[PDB]
Amino acid sequence: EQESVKEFLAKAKEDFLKKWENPAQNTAHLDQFERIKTIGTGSFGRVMLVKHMETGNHYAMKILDKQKVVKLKQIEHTLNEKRILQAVNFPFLVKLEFSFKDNSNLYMVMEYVPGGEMFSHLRRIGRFSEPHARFYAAQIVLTFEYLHSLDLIYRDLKPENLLIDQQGYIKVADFGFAKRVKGRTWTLCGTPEYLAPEIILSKGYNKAVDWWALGVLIYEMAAGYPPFFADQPIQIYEKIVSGKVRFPSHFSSDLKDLLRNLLQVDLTKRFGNLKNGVNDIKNHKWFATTDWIAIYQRKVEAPFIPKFKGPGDTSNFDDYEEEEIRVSINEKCGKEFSEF
Amino acid sequence: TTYADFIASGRTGRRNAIHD
Ligand SMILES: Cc1cncc2cccc(S(=O)(=O)N3CCCNC[C@@H]3C)c12
Numbered sequence: 001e002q003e004s005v006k007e008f009l010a011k012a013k014e015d016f017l018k019k020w021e022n023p024a025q026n027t028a029h030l031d032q033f034e035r036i037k038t039i040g041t042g043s044f045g046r047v048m049l050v051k052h053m054e055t056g057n058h059y060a061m062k063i064l065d066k067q068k069v070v071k072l073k074q075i076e077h078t079l080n081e082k083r084i085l086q087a088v089n090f091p092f093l094v095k096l097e098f099s100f101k102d103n104s105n106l107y108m109v110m111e112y113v114p115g116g117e118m119f120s121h122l123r124r125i126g127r128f129s130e131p132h133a134r135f136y137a138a139q140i141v142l143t144f145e146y147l148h149s150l151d152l153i154y155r156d157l158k159p160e161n162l163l164i165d166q167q168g169y170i171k172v173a174d175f176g177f178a179k180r181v182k183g184r185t186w187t188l189c190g191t192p193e194y195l196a197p198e199i200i201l202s203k204g205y206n207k208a209v210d211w212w213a214l215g216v217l218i219y220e221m222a223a224g225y226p227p228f229f230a231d232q233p234i235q236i237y238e239k240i241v242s243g244k245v246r247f248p249s250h251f252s253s254d255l256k257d258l259l260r261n262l263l264q265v266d267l268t269k270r271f272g273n274l275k276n277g278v279n280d281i282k283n284h285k286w287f288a289t290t291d292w293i294a295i296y297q298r299k300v301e302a303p304f305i306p307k308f309k310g311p312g313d314t315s316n317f318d319d320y321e322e323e324e325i326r327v328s329i330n331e332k333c334g335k336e337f338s339e340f
Numbered sequence: 341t342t343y344a345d346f347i348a349s350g351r352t353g354r355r356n357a358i359h360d
Contacts, residue, residue: 043356072359119354126343160354177357188360193351225346233358248342 002279009149012089016150019087020180025340028098028109030325033061036312038320040117042174044069044078045105046323049112049314058312059097060113063325064106066333074176075336077189081175082108082340084152091298092143094163094171101340103328113171115164115306116316118221122159127224130252130286132303136162137218138287138295139170144214145278148207151180157213158191159220168302192233193226197265200237211272211281215262222255223248227263241265254286 033050040047044064051058069078085096085108095111118136122128128136140157147154155177163171177189184204190196194216196209220226228239243265247256258281264270271280282292294300306316346352 074359123352156357158355189358191355191357193355224343229346229349229351231350246342 012146013150015089016087023083024086024099026100028100030102030107035325037314038322039314039317041320043072049312050109051312058112059109060111062108062110066104066106066337070333070336077176078106079339080179084178084180085175090143090146091296092139092170092172094173101337103331104326106337106340111171113163113165114308114313114316115166117160118162118164119159121164122221128221130222130255133218133221134287134290135300135303136170136221138290138292140214140217141278141281142292142296143172144210151182152178153181153185153207154178154210156190157210157217158194159217164306166306166308167298168305169298192236193229195237195240197241198267200241208267208270208273211270212263215259219259222251258284258286
């Protein structure tokens with residue numbers, strides 16, 4: 001079993017490396033897409049539903065203002081985002097279909113994933129049952145196994161970054177702080193409720209912070225709220241570094257035991273970071289019902305299938321204030337974003 | 341309850357990442 005894993009991932013590395021050292025580049029242009037509706041927003045620009053006209057397929061195109069990226073000192077991060085994303089391939093990683101730039105903008109046309117954000121479903125329903133959250137957790141366990149094995153750290157796991165597709169399965173969108181590193185890294189980043197303690201204490205950290213972020217996700221999915229919360233960030237970091245977590249009463253004993261081993265402050269005793277590796281999570285009593293190969297294969301019945309009134313339907317996403325894409329007649333930031 | 345404290349907090353919407 002764990003030698004299929006070894007072999008699967010070895011082949012995946014042959015694949016991921018070819019694309020890593022020679023990235024796809026300028027495989028489309030703006031005016032080949034019909035811009036329909038803003039379906040989400042981040043700090044860098046908007047995400048829109050678009051239809052590719054020659055083929056009729058719908059995608060989500062993420063626009064990033066080059067100048068806003070610079071001001072935000074996210075230039076190396078945004079080259080990381082695209083290079084990493086064009087190069088990976090896994091069922092639970094949102095697909096980067098096309099990418100290109102103009103005078104004003106960076107563009108990242110991805111798989112349109114019509115089911116909505118884990119986030120807004122989690123907040124609507126309140127909280128997931130353990131079986132339900134396990135289904136999702138399993139998909140994040142296998143994805144991180146895939147990512148970590150290619151020397152990637154994801155670094156921004158949250159419900160906001162997980163998109164449910166038609167079959168109720170998951171897609172890790174947003175790769176804005178993912179990073180290929182062997183050894184330690186120091187950038188202060190992620191989202192406050194999910195930061196590992198070593199990230200807060202400016203210590204220098206590794207892939208184990210994704211594993212801790214796995215714990216927060218699962219807790220948040222099963223409790224309805226995160227393990228450490230407050231109104232300001234600085235009070236969240238107090239509660240994180242303090243090394244105490246109260247569990248809801250309805251939490252099963254096995255689930256509390258996974259979380260105690262995931263949201264472990266001490267790196268030498270934290271699941272994912274030990275010598276057995278990712279399997280101290282896969283073979284854990286909480287995932288005893290979980291058939292990892294069937295999860296990979298898409299064979300299991302999702303516990304929730306999003307609503308789908310047809311192609312180009314945006315009802316599982318919010319509405320947002322529309323704004324024109326403007327392309328300056330002069331090139332901005334060409335030296336900096338050259339390799340995009 | 342812990343839930344009530346949370347839905348009454350200011351961090352129930354989409355959460356931004358930090359920059360440094
Ligand atoms: C709606 C959507 C729909 N389809 C694909 C997507 C791919 C990436 C991001 C989004 S997105 O949700 O707009 N999005 C970015 C905006 C900030 N929120 C994080 C989330 C991953 C997609």
